[PDB]
Symmetry: C3
Subunit: 455 residues, 3 copies
């Protein structure tokens, strides 16, 4: 017998289609190769990143713990599996007791002493109604869930390394931009100084030009720190140093990622690890019900042994000293003060908690993918508008610089043009990083980088 309820997977408490609106491109429906099946070696096209991810898959300590957890849960299933077989061992025994005359059969105080060397088992529970099998099946699903928890932890690490790599790259572009802009402001300042001395440029013009130089200089120190701090964060995720022999990497103006299909929401239920992790834990709670039910039914037990017993230690292995035992037992609960019902009620509550947790897991994934798809349908337009802002601002600066040196306009115009171009360029870099980070997280949200190659 097995009293585990028959398992049926809850229905997905989300929409059948991903959201539509001004922010969303057209829904593309089912895909033959879902994002989860696409390798990170395929998804990430930067060969420097591909190597960094490989270093991290081997040296990161968090993912190392995740791997060892699976092992630890397998071990706990191996214990629960062994509870079904008899614990057989050797039992050496000694007894020596003085008893009063009203207890000893002879009628006067006496010492009764006995010894034994026996081989067999003690309190071996026979699993007729599947109490121990249910607990084994609970322990098996918990292991299975931990295996998916590992796969989820890798998809987290992959996305983390990618984001950290791309942040360092964006901040390295911010830094080089500031160096070039400082040098340009400095050169511009030197002409203004030169003009001031000869009495053409005013004192105001000079201090305005001074403001542009000191601002850029303060910005230079910030990104110098941010770059270093981005390096430190990358090293931590790798679990070791940045390798020396790194392949030439790609630039932020190149296509760094492969475009990944959204698929259908229902794809998540078979592909996304932390949804499958939660399902396996729901299956584990279902199995535990079968153990709480078998508590109502008779509990069969057996104690048996064979060996040698004697009244004196020396007379143990002598002839005519053999001994065996057969001690079966059955126990059926009649009256518990509502105790067994509460234990079944409890296991039933634990299943419903797991239903809800599994459902929340689905609803979370839907939200995360939908967010990624809103970035996909808006960042191309935004980047293009920012590119056009940079292009217009540059033309604006060139005319402004020309009209100041000529004496047609004030320095305030050139100052406005200096700031506007510089803030627009810094922004383009940030926007590009946000678009790429969003794409990387969408990949993770669909099933991530568990596979190195495509399945």
């Amino acid at each position: 017998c097995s009293l585990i309820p028959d398992y049926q997977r809850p229905e997905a408490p989300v929409a059948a289609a991903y959201p539509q609106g001004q922010a969303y491109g057209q829904n593309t429906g089912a895909a033959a190769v879902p994002a989860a099946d696409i390798g990170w070696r395929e998804f990430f096209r930067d060969p420097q990143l591909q190597q960094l991810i490989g270093v991290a898959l081997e040296n990161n300590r968090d993912l190392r713990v995740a791997a060892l957890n699976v092992e630890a849960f397998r071990a706990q299933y191996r214990i629960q599996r062994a509870d079904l077989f008899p614990r057989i061992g050797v039992d050496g025994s000694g007894t020596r007791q003085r008893l009063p005359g009203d207890l000893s059969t002879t009628g006067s105080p006496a010492i009764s002493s006995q010894y034994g060397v026996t081989l067999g088992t003690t309190a071996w529970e026979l699993d007729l109604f599947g109490r121990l099998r249910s607990l084994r099946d609970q322990a098996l699903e918990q292991y299975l869930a931990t295996e998916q928890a590992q796969r989820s932890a890798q998809t987290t690490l992959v996305a983390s390394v990618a984001t950290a790599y791309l942040t360092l790259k964006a901040d390295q572009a911010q830094l080089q931009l500031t160096k070039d802009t400082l040098g340009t402001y400095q050169k511009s300042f030197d002409l203004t100084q030169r003009s001031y001395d000869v009495g053409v440029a005013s004192a105001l013009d000079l201090r305005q030009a001074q403001t542009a130089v000191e601002g850029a200089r303060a910005t230079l120190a910030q990104y110098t720190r941010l770059v270093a701090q981005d390096q430190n964060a990358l090293v931590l995720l790798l679990g070791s140093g940045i390798p020396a022999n790194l392949p030439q990497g790609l630039g932020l103006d190149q296509t760094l990622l492969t475009e990944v299909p959204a698929g259908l929401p229902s794809d998540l239920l078979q592909r996304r690890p932390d949804i499958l992790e939660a399902e396996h834990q729901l299956m584990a709670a279902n199995a535990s019900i079968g153990a709480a039910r078998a508590a109502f039914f008779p509990s069969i037990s057996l104690t048996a042994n064979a060996g040698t017993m004697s009244r004196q230690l020396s007379g143990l292995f002598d002839a005519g000293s053999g001994s065996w035992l057969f001690q079966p037992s059955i126990n059926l609960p009649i009256f518990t003060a509502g105790s067994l019902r509460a234990s079944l009620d409890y296991a039933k509550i634990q299943k419903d908690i797991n239903v809800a947790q599994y459902e929340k897991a689905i609803q979370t994934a839907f939200q995360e993918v939908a967010d990624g798809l809103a970035a996909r349908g808006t960042f191309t337009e935004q980047l293009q508008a920012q590119r056009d802002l940079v292009k217009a601002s540059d033309e604006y600066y060139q005319l402004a610089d020309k009209r100041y040196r000529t004496g047609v306009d004030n320095y305030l115009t050139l100052l406005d043009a200096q700031r506007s171009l510089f803030t627009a360029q810094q922004q383009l870099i940030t926007d590009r990083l946000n678009q790429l980070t969003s794409e990387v997280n969408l990949y993770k949200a669909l099933g991530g980088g568990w596979n190195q190659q495509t399945v």
Copy 2:
């Protein structure tokens, strides 16, 4: 007889009144109808949000798990409650053993057998010193805490739905403002294009107008994304999709919330689910000391049954095969190597941990309410100043535009007027959102979100 110490609620380690100063309006004193007693249907005035909150209460999976934990702790209480009663069951027994001559009775090797079927209890602990009663009282108290934790989980969710709805509402208003602003920027640019074509407007004027357009173009795509992502976040909190027959919502310029009276700091100890939760945990720890003390006192046990016994399985239920057993036991510990007092010390340490946690819960609650009252006394003036800025910026915009089209001054004044107005209008939307959400959290901070209608 129980050995549970008397309970005394620790003093509230906060000030008797809420803070005063520049950021705080005058304290309101005692509240006739405390915030906790006021319904979210009374607090929230938007009928659409009210409906949406109702949808979240039935569908949100986090709150659902919270509702189930209460039942799981109730069941655990019911288990501990039952263990004060004797467990009555049916025991079937068997014993077949070979014994050598010197251990047997007969003086010669023999096989003795006995069989029994009986009805009764095994090792029933007579709770004389209240060890099991203490463990039941600990369990009941943990259940009572878990009930309070459900109320706290609801006050959180209500605040989360309100914030996610108000956030969406603001970003929608941002989106529309950006759409309108781009429209006026596009017209202005086209007027400049024509003016340049006749030789009035300069090339600089035209490119200044262009940077204004492309900048709004990038803001439009950002708010288009933000709006969509704000909807995804709300749907996750609801636990389902947005309903189809929702009533008309209210605008952000209208009165949205029924501002809640603060009351006195002491109201928190009676009404905030967070604090009441930590008190029940304290009372639960207090009860564990009763079970640790009881271990020093005599332990009373009983094994008692009645039924049938026989040398042969065939003779079990026959006439004259009747049997009973009465086997009471008492154990009083004398030497434990310090085990028992260490267990008691541990029990006493846990209560101190829980006292310290109870006090922190009150200190944290004071901090949250006070921050909410710092916002209340400052946001009135901040929004008045931001409104006045917007009005002044609109007048500044119109004069500068009028002055540019006439040729009496440059385009830089108009560009500056355009940016100041747009920046100021965006910021007003954000300030209103910061103000509203501070009020929403103030309501939760006093423990408000539990009742639908005012009690």
Copy 3:
């Protein structure tokens, strides 16, 4: 007899020296007086902060819980140390059973009886192969780890208080600066208002002047709130209100801290609490392997008592009613269906998990110090540039101010000079706050403020 494997401390999986580059000062080397040994009384120069940290060390509830946790884990060590010694108690027992004809000694239905009041030990496990000692040593090292966790709890509190204090101080400077700036803008606006009524200032000049005032009015309301809420965040950390008679505090522009040496990364291995905490947890898991190994070896148990026994209750403490029992046992497991191997595998897996967690603690500590040195090597430059910017903006505002009211220039240039200076000054305060925070957090990363005076 102990089966605990030899403890070898894993090698540091970090670089032999802290990073170098554009953002870093030269590596100073090994320090005579390490950062961990510097007292917080020495490190924090501000006497108002020293009184506050003292208040927090005795009133903060989370540090109270952390110190009580040490007592709880110590009590847990004592409980398991006691399991090595025999539990001696007084055991009183009764027995009364009816036996049917075939089972009785008389051949007919008889009632047997047995009583006894005794003093002894039941089931005493003689720790021959060190199973119980391994469990005791496991519990010891978890106590030793909790002792280190308390030390980490303090260094965290010390940093949190210092940061909270500095943040309130920086926001007090932001508020004061805004009061000064608002008065300057209002003065300026009024003089424009007087110049407007006389047909010298235009309607454009006046509205520009107005926007500045309303803008400054809104920032005032904001900083009034942030100061209030910053006080509230500090009170929570103190576990108590702010004292009225505090010592005189130093301003943000003073020398507030002593320069703490970085040392070598290999200092952290001996001097950082949470790294040492991780090491004891690893050591504790190493000891648990000794208890898993000793499950394969013989298990000795001993039951021994002395007292009085009788057939009747009345003849208990009578002459010749004395009794004793001596019952040695030895168990050796032979067949387990892999059970003991799985339990040994589990212990070994847990040790491997603690190795990875110990290696991660070192890698994490490396990141935090390296980021702290990157802040050290860049903030001097940033703040120098920002100070020079403030000065240049100051000269700029003064020139722009006179140039307007003399009729030489227009208000827009004055307006822009006002924005630049006010923004410049606000950013200088923020950069000062962040420079100081980084130094505060660096001190904590190296091993923090456990010692009051320098060691």
